[PDB]
Amino acid sequence: LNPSARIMTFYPTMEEFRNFSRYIAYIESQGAHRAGLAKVVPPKEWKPRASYDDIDDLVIPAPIQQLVTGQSGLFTQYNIQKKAMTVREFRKIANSDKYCTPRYSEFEELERKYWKNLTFNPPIYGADVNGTLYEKHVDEWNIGRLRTILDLVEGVNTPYLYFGMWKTSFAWHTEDMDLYSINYLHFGEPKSWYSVPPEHGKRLERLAKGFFPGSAQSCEAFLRHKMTLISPLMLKKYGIPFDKVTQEAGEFMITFPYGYHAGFNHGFNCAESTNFATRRWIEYGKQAVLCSCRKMVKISMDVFVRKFQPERYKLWKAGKDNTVIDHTLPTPEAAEF
Ligand SMILES: [Cl-]
Ligand SMILES: [Zn+2]
Ligand SMILES: [Zn+2]
């Protein structure tokens, strides 16, 4: 199942789509998790909100100006927190001559423009806005209430909004605690993604440590700072396997445990995201290498070990748990498929 570890796209029917956790387990039986990223195109009839015409006065409390430094495909992104602005103000700046998307034929052209110009004219990313664009009655794939085993913890169970503009980027990273994530592009211009299969994640980390040794000495898990940008050409040069995909409005992206991802926004858009878990994640949770230098998201794995692994509970607390994760294996919940 998926030996190539290539990004898979799924087109569930309304019946298949209704049960989120079951569908995550189905895509895993198909080997989608091997890529570390999957796309899910929901049924045509499904909409999480009737219209996005009432969000002009929605406040983005901490928009960030993204300053990128670097050359030859290696970059460091610095965030400058700007004062609170409304979606109306943000959209005006996003669509202005200074910050709008350049003209292009194919995506390859826009991708070249992104890697050529990411250090110039720093954009503003309306990122990490606490909130949802989902209407209350929406029961299918509601990011605000997915009801996975992650709910056992209960502030990383909560939804976040991302208002993008051309050239805004998310640096190479896996999720906090090496969790899964769900990303829905509500509206606007596309969002392009790069992924490194979980089975090759250590190779990406080794490459990154070699390039930023100062950062590697200060923090073992320095990629969790979400400041490191590495071009696909650099990954190709050093033999890091990866894949790319463009997410369009109305599509979901799923990131899997220990799936490194990066990317950028084509223009003015809005995405919603949260983290979630499956029984498979638990092991990734106990083995996750965390950021040491920052006082960072940490989940106590005790609750999850005493419920789903009670046989290994005593051995793990003693430090005798020598379990080696096989990234190719699907979640136990995929057994029905
Ligand atoms: Cl809008
Ligand atoms: Zn992410
Ligand atoms: Zn750190």
UniProtKB/Swiss-Prot annotation:
The record lists Fe cation as bound by: H173, E175, H261
Question: Where does this polypeptide localize?
Answer: Nucleus
Q: What positions does the domain JmjN occupy?
A: 7-49
Q: What is the effect of changing G131A?
A: Abolishes histone demethylase activity
Q: Which tissues express it?
A: Ubiquitous.
Reading the lineage from the top rank, the first entry is Eukaryota
Swapping G126A leads to an effect described as: Abolishes histone demethylase activity
The record's account of how the chain is modified after translation: Ubiquitinated by RNF8 and RNF168 following DNA damage, leading to its degradation. Degradation promotes accessibility of H4K20me2 mark for DNA repair protein TP53BP1, which is then recruited. Also ubiquitinated by the SCF(FBXO22) complex; leading to proteasomal degradation.
Q: Which residues does the annotation say bind Zn(2+)?
A: C219, H225, C291, C293
Q: Where is the JmjC domain?
A: 135-293
UniProt binding sites for 2-oxoglutarate: Y125, N183, K191, K226
Family stated for the protein in its record: Belongs to the JHDM3 histone demethylase family.
What assembly does the database describe for this protein?
Interacts with histone deacetylase proteins HDAC1, HDAC2 and HDAC3. Interacts with RB and NCOR1. Interacts with VRK1. Interacts with FBXO22; this interaction promotes KDM4A ubiquitination.
Tell what the record comments on domains. The 2 Tudor domains recognize and bind methylated histone H3 'Lys-4' residue (H3K4me). Double Tudor domain has an interdigitated structure and the unusual fold is required for its ability to bind methylated histone tails. Trimethylated H3 'Lys-4' (H3K4me3) is bound in a cage of 3 aromatic residues, 2 of which are from the Tudor domain 2, while the binding specificity is determined by side-chain interactions involving residues from the Tudor domain 1. The Tudor domains are also able to bind trimethylated histone H3 'Lys-9' (H3K9me3), di- and trimethylated H4 'Lys-20' (H4K20me2 and H4K20me3).
Q: What is this protein's function per UniProt?
A: Histone demethylase that specifically demethylates 'Lys-9' and 'Lys-36' residues of histone H3, thereby playing a central role in histone code. Does not demethylate histone H3 'Lys-4', H3 'Lys-27' nor H4 'Lys-20'. Demethylates trimethylated H3 'Lys-9' and H3 'Lys-36' residue, while it has no activity on mono- and dimethylated residues. Demethylation of Lys residue generates formaldehyde and succinate. Participates in transcriptional repression of ASCL2 and E2F-responsive promoters via the recruitment of histone deacetylases and NCOR1, respectively.
**What is the protein name for this chain?**
Lysine-specific demethylase 4A
Q: Species name for this entry?
A: Homo sapiens (Human)
According to the entry, what is the taxonomic lineage of the organism? Answer: Eukaryota, Metazoa, Chordata, Craniata, Vertebrata
Encoded by which gene? KDM4A
